[PDB]
Amino acid sequence: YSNELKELFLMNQTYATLFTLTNKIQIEGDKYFGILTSRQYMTILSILHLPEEETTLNNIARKMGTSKQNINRLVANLEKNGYVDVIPSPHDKRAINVKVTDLGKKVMVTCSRTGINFMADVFHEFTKDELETLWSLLKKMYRFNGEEQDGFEEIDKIKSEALEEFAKRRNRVNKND
Amino acid sequence: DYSNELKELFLMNQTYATLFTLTNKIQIEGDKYFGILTSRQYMTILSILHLPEEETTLNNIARKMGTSKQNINRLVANLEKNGYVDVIPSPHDKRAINVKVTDLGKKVMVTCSRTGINFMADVFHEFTKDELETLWSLLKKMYRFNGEEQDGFEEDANEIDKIKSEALEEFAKRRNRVNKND
Ligand code: NA
């Protein structure tokens, strides 16, 4: 059974590493963002990526890979902080729609800029090839049970100083003293 | 002009997005498999069992889990209320604690570990050993982006009785998808 033991060990270690990595990346992302948590940020972004009419708890839950119950708690938190407004859905009386407010959008402009520095730092050791490989393997793991990911104008909004700072942080161009 | 930078940023955004939503799904799915613990509870108890008894401080457990002291304090308080751990003073520092897994905590972990093996088979059934080595390696690389490397569970490597042999047989059959038969 040595082949089986070695496969199991490798699976255990890959799982444990996924879990502790996401813990670390969550904590680190919260420090970068500063004014939102990573979970708040990703929930607002998920809402911005849906059509207003389709911003239901179920659709938001599917986009985030999580349960309706978790999105319900997150959305109530966003509403009490004044980041979203929650109205009844016009298609279904049991469902909701979520609109991002002016405050929400303001905080997202600030967090997106910081987000660009965070991506630069997190992936500075990766080639483009290795990122594509990582992304591909994470998508394969997603569909282990038969159900596939629902992933994520926008280009024109990124200003040239952000991309300049991104290039410098990613490439470690600076000759350190 | 910044087309290359935009491309790289987009790809990093998608990888991060996919990582986040994947671990959300794996957590919910792991909760369903284990049944009598959540995944977080399970991994916290396992982190405690990989540390020496005297070095089961909040800080050391946090470091093993890749999270904060405050998050471990809440997890450990939830485990204590459930009867899975006892919390006692650290003998080496008056401020610090130690955490001991109770007999009820050990029994629940034996049940969850067995289920754990079937979960691993299912989650990774499409992966070759080589893909797993590649994924693991790339996850370790991302971990150390800030200069701090992972403090992992790799000391698991360094007696197969009948019960273990049956668990390993079920593992191989699940992994190789001998059902979808009819
Ligand atoms: Na974004």
Automatic annotation (TrEMBL), chain A:
It comes from the Bacteria. Residues 1-143 form the HTH marR-type domain. Keywords: DNA-binding, Transcription, Transcription regulation. GO terms for molecular function: DNA binding; DNA-binding transcription factor activity. SMART domains: HTH_MARR. InterPro entries: HTH_MarR-typ, Tscrpt_reg_MarR-type_CS, WH-like_DNA-bd_sf, WH_DNA-bd_sf. Coiled coil: none annotated. It holds the Pfam family MarR_2. PANTHER family: TRANSCRIPTIONAL REGULATOR, MARR, TRANSCRIPTIONAL REPRESSOR OF EMRAB OPERON. This is Transcriptional regulator, MarR family. It comes from Clostridioides difficile (strain 630).
